[PDB]
Write a protein that binds this ligand. Structure first.
Ligand SMILES: CC(C)c1cccc2c(-c3ccc(CNC(=O)[C@@H](N)CO)c(F)c3)c(C(=O)O)[nH]c12
Ligand SMILES: [Zn+2]
Ligand SMILES: [Zn+2]
Length: 232
């Protein structure tokens, strides 16, 4: 009823959308992994009379439900998708997207890591993102590679028309007490990568984490704090 959705308000197998700004939505789904249930976010950005999708809904069936929810709530076609790193919460569902006519994209690093993990593999490679601080335009967004953080390949996404920063899994929500799933992380570099984000996007108004609730710019400093306290 208007609050940000949580696992407790998403019916089983289902996806919810949340309006962030004009022409910007997040998508929220839930999935089980190793016997626990987690929410995850992605982004939808209006691209004229088409939509750009950022990240899958963490699984094939979730991603099919995402497409249905978009059709119901927005009614514009998803034409392109970008995955912001190689984990299944970002790429699981790419095969569904690819068979639904969506062109799927990720950095070459993400594609290599996805293939090596046995995860679904986006079709198209995004060049120009291999060095930290790199940025490229992609439709209505800017893609930015901040350096290694949650993963070596993690990308963030900025929507300049709305000053929305989608941090993905490199950014955690304010209520977080832990650095999440750090199996593939670089805890030592992560603060430096967050400082790069902070320097590059000082006018961000909304910051969206990979998992949990959006907030403001404070999510960035909080993230650095939680990662430092974890590493210690
Ligand atoms: C590899 C990928 C598919 C994956 C699988 C499973 C979990 C995760 C998470 C994750 C884990 C924990 C928390 C917060 N803690 C809790 O939710 C407590 N209930 C338990 O510690 C969180 F915010 C995110 C992340 C991430 O960090 O990006 N990626 C995950
Ligand atoms: Zn991840
Ligand atoms: Zn994640």
């Amino acid at each position: 009823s208007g609050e940000y959705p949580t696992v407790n308000e998403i019916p089983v197998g289902e996806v919810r959308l949340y309006q962030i700004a004009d022409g910007v939505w997040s998508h929220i789904a839930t999935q089980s992994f190793d016997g626990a249930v987690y929410p995850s976010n992605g982004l939808i950005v209006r691209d004229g009379d088409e939509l750009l999708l950022i990240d899958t809904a963490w699984g094939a069936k979730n991603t099919a439900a995402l497409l249905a929810e978009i059709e119901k709530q927005i009614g514009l076609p998803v034409t392109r998708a970008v995955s912001t790193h190689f984990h299944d919460d970002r790429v699981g569902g790419v095969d569904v997207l690819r068979a639904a006519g969506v062109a799927t994209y990720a950095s070459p690093s993400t594609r290599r890591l996805a293939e090596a993990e046995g995860n679904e593999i986006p079709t198209h490679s995004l060049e120009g993102l291999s060095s930290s601080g790199d940025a490229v335009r992609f439709g209505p967004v800017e893609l930015f590679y901040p350096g290694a953080a949650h993963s070596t390949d993690n990308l963030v996404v900025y929507v300049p028309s709305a000053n929305v920063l989608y941090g993905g899994c490199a950014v955690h929500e304010l209520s977080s007490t832990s650095a999440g799933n750090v199996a593939d992380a670089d805890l030592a570099e992560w603060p430096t990568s967050v400082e790069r984000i902070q320097k590059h996007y000082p006018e961000a108004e909304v910051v969206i984490p990979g998992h949990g609730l959006p907030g403001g710019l404070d999510l960035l400093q909080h993230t650095a704090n939680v990662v430092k306290a974890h590493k210690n």
